Amino acid sequence: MAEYTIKVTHVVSPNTPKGKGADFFAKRVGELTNGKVEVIVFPNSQLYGDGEEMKALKLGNAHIAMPSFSKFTSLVPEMQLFDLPFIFRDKDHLYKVLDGEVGQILKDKVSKKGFVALDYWDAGFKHLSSNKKPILLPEDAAGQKFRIMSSHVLEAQFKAVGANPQVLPFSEVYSALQQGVVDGAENPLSNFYTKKFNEVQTDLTLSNHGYLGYLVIMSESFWKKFPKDLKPMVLQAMKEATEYERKEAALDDEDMLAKISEYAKASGNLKIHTLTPEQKAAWQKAMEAIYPQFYKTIGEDLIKKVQAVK
Ligand SMILES: [Cl-]
Numbered sequence: 001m002a003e004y005t006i007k008v009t010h011v012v013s014p015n016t017p018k019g020k021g022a023d024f025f026a027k028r029v030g031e032l033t034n035g036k037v038e039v040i041v042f043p044n045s046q047l048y049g050d051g052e053e054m055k056a057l058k059l060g061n062a063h064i065a066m067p068s069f070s071k072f073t074s075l076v077p078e079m080q081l082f083d084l085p086f087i088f089r090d091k092d093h094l095y096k097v098l099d100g101e102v103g104q105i106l107k108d109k110v111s112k113k114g115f116v117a118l119d120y121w122d123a124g125f126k127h128l129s130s131n132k133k134p135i136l137l138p139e140d141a142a143g144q145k146f147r148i149m150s151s152h153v154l155e156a157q158f159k160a161v162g163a164n165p166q167v168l169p170f171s172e173v174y175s176a177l178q179q180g181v182v183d184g185a186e187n188p189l190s191n192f193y194t195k196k197f198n199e200v201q202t203d204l205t206l207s208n209h210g211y212l213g214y215l216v217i218m219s220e221s222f223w224k225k226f227p228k229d230l231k232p233m234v235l236q237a238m239k240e241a242t243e244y245e246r247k248e249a250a251l252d253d254e255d256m257l258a259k260i261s262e263y264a265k266a267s268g269n270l271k272i273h274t275l276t277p278e279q280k281a282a283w284q285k286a287m288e289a290i291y292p293q294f295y296k297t298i299g300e301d302l303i304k305k306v307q308a309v310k
């Protein structure tokens with residue numbers, strides 16, 4: 001019935017803001033094209049995972065993806081800017097950066113490496129968890145193995161507090177925590193609960209120590225070939241979906257914290273720790289110390305532009 005089909009691939013649960021956003025995109029394309037185009041969304045790495053999605057887009061075997069910033073850092077080193085610990089003060093700060101000058105500079109870089117860069121999507125600020133002991137101060141992280149996404153900034157960040165970071169694809173994280181391959185991880189609350197990382201960690205600290213978000217991209221050769229008269233509807237669909245995703249993400253921390261809290265009370269197998277300002281300061285000092293290592297590959301003046309956004 002559909003004359004054309006589009007394959008979206010991502011690594012998260014459909015129950016997250018990002019997953020709901022992809023499904024909303026898919027639904028709106030269908031409606032706006034009166035059934036001529038059908039978008040099929042493969043979540044949870046069903047079609048391609050962290051390690052395979054990029055090439056897939058290059059070759060046109062997948063059409064649309066929404067990778068986290070860290071996932072771009074081998075193609076575009078500067079995207080590591082958004083991984084720096086404590087770089088974003090809050091969501092107001094974030095969105096002024098993402099929908100402003102710096103956001104555009106990084107889109108443009110991705111565009112040059114052969115992807116069609118569209119909009120930024122939100123996950124949330126990241127939190128430390130462990131199976132070994134409570135993480136209250138930098139001191140506690142020392143000697144522990146942590147999963148990270150593939151980013152030199154994140155491996156520097158954990159090295160700075162004496163931990164052992166290890167890159168693993170998102171789809172392997174639950175099993176790796178369950179089997180002791182790593183002691184802990186850092187996640188936004190959205191991924192922490194929807195992937196059941198809560199069921200395989202004994203301690204969660206609301207550290208808010210770094211940010212995780214996404215850049216929607218499309219396959220350049222898919223887009224080159226896609227029919228000119230149907231492109232406007234795809235683009236409108238995505239615009240609407242971006243607005244919708246960010247609304248779902250605003251709700252998300254409160255909803256997820258309630259669910260994680262109920263799980264901890266009912267199961268007795270998770271303690272949730274909040275930090276004192278004293279504790280927060282110490283995290284900021286230890287983790288920001290890494291910034292100068294990255295003036296060369298990210299750009300000192302780029303980091304300063306972000307810090308200056310009021
Ligand atoms: Cl909250």
